[PDB]
Write a protein that binds this ligand. Structure first.
Ligand SMILES: CC[C@@H]1/C=C(\C)C[C@H](C)C[C@H](OC)[C@H]2O[C@@](O)(C(=O)C(=O)N3CCCC[C@H]3C(=O)O[C@H](/C(C)=C/[C@@H]3CC[C@@H](O)[C@H](OC)C3)[C@H](C)[C@@H](O)CC1=O)[C@H](C)C[C@@H]2OC
Ligand SMILES: [Ca+2]
Ligand SMILES: [Ca+2]
Ligand SMILES: [Ca+2]
Ligand SMILES: [Ca+2]
Lengths: 190, 107
């Protein structure tokens, strides 16, 4: 008998509260555009304190130096999304533009665009089956069987794939997610 | 908060500490007893590390009071569970939860 999520839930509605919680936790811990002069100046101080090797770019090793991020399964995705030019590390401009997506007085649509970018690994604008499984696997780990996780991934995409190309576009993702108001959870003080 | 009630006792000495990983089987029910989730139905035990903010506060405070082999009923108030918001599509707001948890192993 195939596995169903509680209340026959789709994997987006199911994992989004954890996504919004763990991304907010990461940034709040990193901090311990839409910014004004003082808010950018505050972020420049907290950036240089985590540079460690003074290379001018936050790397994966420096991000995992904080003990609060060691067991956060969404660290690498946030680093990958911040890495706009895709060089493996995070510059200060990428740091400012990455934190700006979570500032209050930010747009709702851009906060859903970040939530979409959590699952869209290759950043082509479409969530593929392998992408959705792999990102959910980082959060689920061993707590589900791969067969169970694969089954709910299949049903979610099949029900959400409106145009029938096997992938989930941002418009299809917004049709499943829109009523969740996940943007209200993605807020960090600067 | 969380009320721990023993169903079956385990070895009294080995209690999970911060940093350890608790391997459990659980069945989650609403206060009226209606089941909403069960790791036994999945044939996959649930695992989490204590002190790393991975579970609700009722599980953090409740499972810590448990020991290896013990099976207990955990009655959790909303403030220690999902509060006045609930969990979207599963847990209603202000919902008191009852968890039948058994601590299988620590690793
Ligand atoms: C990819 C998302 C990820 C899911 C898993 C890795 C699979 C895992 C088996 C969860 C079940 O998935 C089938 C399922 O189990 C429940 O049914 C349950 O019985 C419970 O309550 N559990 C169950 C575990 C014991 C404690 C308690 C609990 O803490 O769960 C946490 C939880 C939901 C925390 C929320 C997250 C956002 C935040 O706002 C809120 O703040 C109060 C707390 C889970 C483990 C997250 O750490 C990880 C995921 O979410 C709850 C109802 C929903 C939950 O599904 C999501
Ligand atoms: Ca560096
Ligand atoms: Ca970069
Ligand atoms: Ca993609
Ligand atoms: Ca599609």
């Amino acid at each position: 008998h195939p596995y169903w999520l509680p209340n026959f839930m789709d994997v987006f509605t199911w994992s989004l509260p954890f996504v919004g919680e763990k991304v907010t936790e990461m940034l709040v811990n990193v901090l311990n555009s839409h910014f004004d002069a003082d808010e950018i100046k505050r972020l420049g101080k907290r950036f240089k304190k985590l540079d460690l090797d003074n290379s001018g770019s936050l790397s994966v090793e420096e991000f995992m130096s904080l003990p609060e991020l060691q067991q956060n399964p969404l660290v690498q995705r946030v680093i990958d999304i911040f890495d706009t030019d895709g060089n493996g590390e995070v510059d200060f401009k990428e740091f400012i533009e990455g934190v700006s997506q979570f500032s209050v007085k930010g747009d709702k649509e851009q906060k859903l665009r970040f939530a979409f970018r959590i699952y869209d690994m290759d950043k082509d604008g479409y969530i593929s089956n392998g992408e959705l499984f792999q990102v959910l696997k980082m959060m689920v780990g061993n707590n589900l069987k791969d067969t169970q996780l694969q089954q709910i991934v299949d049903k979610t995409i099949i029900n959400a794939d409106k145009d029938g190309d096997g992938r989930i576009s941002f418009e299809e993702f917004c049709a499943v997610v829109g009523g969740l108001d996940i943007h209200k959870k993605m807020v960090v003080d600067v | 908060g969380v009320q721990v009630e023993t169903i079956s006792p385990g070895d009294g000495r080995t209690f999970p500490k911060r940093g350890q990983t608790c391997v459990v089987h659980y069945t989650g029910m609403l206060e009226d007893g209606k089941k909403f989730d069960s790791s036994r139905d999945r044939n996959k035990p649930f695992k989490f590390m204590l002190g790393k903010q991975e579970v609700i506060r009722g599980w953090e405070e409740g499972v810590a009071q448990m020991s290896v082999g013990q099976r207990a009923k955990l009655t959790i108030s909303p403030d220690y569970a999902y509060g006045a918001t609930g969990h979207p599509g599963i847990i209603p707001p202000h919902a008191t939860l009852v968890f039948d948890v058994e601590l299988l192993k620590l690793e």
